[PDB]
């Protein structure tokens, strides 16, 4: 996270860490959506040009964490993966369309003060909250700058941008399955996600019911926190039908 701040303990209890087992390495972020289901970005798991085509056996997840490096006895829980699921229509050659993946844990994770799922949105919430100018929150152990890594989980709040401004910020074919957030150059304030934040959540809190909803998945930016550039997030609601298909099948 660029220009963010340390999370308070417990501020983001759906925050998940995705590790490669061997060599043990932090790949991406991700979010707890049930007691067996974790949501990340596809490109976190599948990107051939960067030698990334993982199976369940390759990875594990850590949940309940605050510090990037230091282990946390009785807080942190490590989980094995039963099965990875990547959207069938995920595009990686071009534009990162449908950058969405689901992971099933091999065991239910126990909830605590540090571990707790986030809500997926519905039509009402998506219509209410996905408006330009409205701010959401992005978290992660990604870099603090474009060119070290943070000691503790970072958090930053960012305004959703109007589609035309998104469209014009990049020459990447942008799709209706992503939105962009971040400040315009004239707005003075800064901040963005960066390398390592991928797959983590973009959450908003509902004024109707006081709950946290995951509106986006951190997907891509050209650099971090550049003027006239914006962050791109997978639109969770537009893909919710797939999320339900997988979870409802469990397989």
């Amino acid at each position: 996270i660029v220009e963010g701040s340390d999370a308070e303990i417990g501020m983001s209890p759906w925050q998940v860490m995705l590790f490669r087992k061997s060599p043990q390495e932090l790949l991406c972020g991700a979010s707890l959506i049930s007691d067996r289901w974790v949501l990340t970005a596809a490109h976190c798991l599948l990107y051939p040009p960067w030698d990334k085509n993982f199976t369940e056996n390759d990875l594990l997840v850590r949940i309940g964490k605050h510090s990037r490096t230091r282990y946390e006895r009785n807080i942190e829980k490590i989980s094995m993966l039963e099965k990875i699921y990547i959207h069938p229509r995920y595009n990686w050659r071009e534009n990162l369309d449908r950058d969405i993946a689901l992971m099933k844990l091999k065991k239910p994770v126990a909830f605590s003060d540090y571990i707790h799922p986030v809500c997926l949105p519905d039509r009402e919430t998506a219509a209410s909250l996905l408006q330009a100018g409205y701010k959401g929150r992005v978290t992660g152990w990604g870099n603090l700058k474009e060119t070290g890594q943070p000691s503790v989980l970072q958090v930053v709040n960012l305004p959703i941008v109007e589609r035309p401004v998104c469209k014009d910020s990049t020459r990447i074919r942008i799709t209706d399955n992503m939105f962009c957030a971040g400040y315009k150059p004239d707005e003075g304030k800064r901040g963005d996600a960066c390398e390592g934040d991928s797959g983590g959540p973009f959450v908003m809190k509902s004024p109707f019911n006081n709950r946290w909803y995951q509106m986006g998945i951190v997907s891509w930016g050209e650099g971090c926190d550049r003027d006239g550039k914006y962050g791109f997030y997978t639109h969770v609601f537009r893909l919710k039908k797939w999320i339900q298909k997988v979870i409802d099948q469990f397989g």
Binding site: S5, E8, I9, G10, M11, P13, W14, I33, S34, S112, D113, H116, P117, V118, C119, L120, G133, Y134, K135, G136, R137, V155, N157, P159, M204, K205, S206, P207, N210, R211, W212, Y213
Partner: peptide, 28 residues
């Protein structure tokens, strides 16, 4: 999922976090 998105150390204890009002204030 009945209880998703309510944070044990925040919403469950009726404590506001450090920056969530920023989200709030961005709805007006």
């Amino acid at each position: 999922e009945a209880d998703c998105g309510l944070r044990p150390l925040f919403e469950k204890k009726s404590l506001e976090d450090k920056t969530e009002r920023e989200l709030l204030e961005s709805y007006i």
